[PDB]
Swiss-Prot record, chain B:
Localization annotation: Cytoplasm
Annotated PH domain residues: 62-165
Expression triggers: By IL-6 in myeloid cells.
Purpose: May be involved in B-cell and macrophage adhesion processes. In B-cells, may act by coupling the B-cell receptor (BCR) to integrin activation. May play a role in src signaling pathway.
Tissues expressing the protein: Expressed in kidney, lung, liver, spleen, bone marrow and testis. Present in T-cells, B-cells, and all cells of the myelomonocytic lineage. Present in all brain regions, with highest levels in neurons from the Purkinje cell layer, hippocampal gyrus, cortex and substantia nigra (at protein level).
The record's note on its domains: The SH3 domain interacts with FYB1 and PTK2B.
Range covered out of full length: 14 to 222 of 358
Subunit relationships: Interacts with LAT, GRB2, PTK2B and PRAM1. Homodimer. Interacts with FYB1, which is required for SKAP2 protein stability. Interacts with PTPNS1. Part of a complex consisting of SKAP2, FYB1 and PTPNS1. Part of a complex consisting of SKAP2, FYB1 and PIRB. May interact with actin. May interact with FYN, HCK and LYN. Interacts with FASLG.
Name of the protein in question: Src kinase-associated phosphoprotein 2
Region spans: Homodimerization: 1-51
Entry superkingdom: Eukaryota
Length: 170, 168
């Protein structure tokens, strides 16, 4: 509605209905209703997506997918050794960046939490005509992920979205 | 926006009605009660979007607009009854009027559904004449008001017209 405070409420609502009432000695009608409300609480979470725009998990079950798309991906330290870019379906699910073989896979090839990372355009990562499509996601532990996006715009949109999440959430 | 208030309606119904007289522990009861007051409290945040038992002026829920006005009924003006200072408050779709902002109880009130409203600069021989309006009930009763400036009048009309129309 006018958001923070409402999400503050719904958080308390969820704590209540899901935990506080757990174990309680409730009518059959009240139990059935509690299960309902929990599901509805769950589904409503997706609504606050536009505002923002590790266990195995399928591509299609990722919750709160802020951005997803095909990118080429390559770690910096593989690049030095001459390893080819890999086509990956990348997803930013909440604060965690996931990568898969395609959007239908049942399990991720890898992921990482972006807290603390930096991101930027970087036109030097490739020698061909696709070099304008490139950005990198820097780890604190010095790990660096390089991407090529499908167009200069595709890349910029990724860097903007990721930069938004990295710094407007403190 | 809607989707959130729809959830909150189901929420308020569960916590306040479904859970009424259920066999709840002390902590579940306390938390229940504490959530009820929290659900009522948030209601005021959707006020901007819109801008009979005795009830005090100050316990009135969802006050879209409120103010001092002079009130008179047209059918009473004929007999000579004059304008009286009233604190008026639109609480949802109900128009309340009190002798002051502090009273314990309304002099009266009416729900405005199906009413009309209009500016009417023909009701006073005064320097106050460009600042009156009327609210007209379907039963043909007409409530005339004088506001504290022409702008204040138009504000009440705009505000009333808004509720009387896009609520629907």
């Amino acid at each position: 509605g006018s958001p923070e405070e409402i999400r503050n409420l719904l958080a308390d609502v969820e704590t209540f209905v899901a935990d506080t009432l757990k174990g309680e000695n409730l009518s059959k009608k009240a139990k059935e209703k509690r299960e309902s409300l929990i599901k509805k609480i769950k589904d409503v979470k997706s609504v606050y997506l536009q505002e923002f725009q590790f266990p195995p998990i399928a591509a299609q079950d990722l919750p709160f997918v802020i951005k997803a798309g095909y990118l080429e991906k390559r770690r910096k330290d593989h690049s030095f050794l001459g390893f080819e870019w890999q086509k990956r379906w990348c997803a930013l699910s909440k604060t965690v960046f996931y990568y898969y073989g395609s959007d239908k896979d049942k399990q991720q090839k890898g992921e990482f939490a972006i807290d603390g990372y930096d991101v930027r355009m970087n036109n030097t990562l490739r020698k061909d005509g696709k070099k304008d499509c490139c950005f990198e996601i820097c780890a604190p532990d010095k790990r660096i992920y390089q991407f090529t996006a499908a167009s200069p715009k595709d890349a910029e949109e990724w860097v903007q979205q990721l930069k938004f999440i990295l710094q407007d959430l403190g």
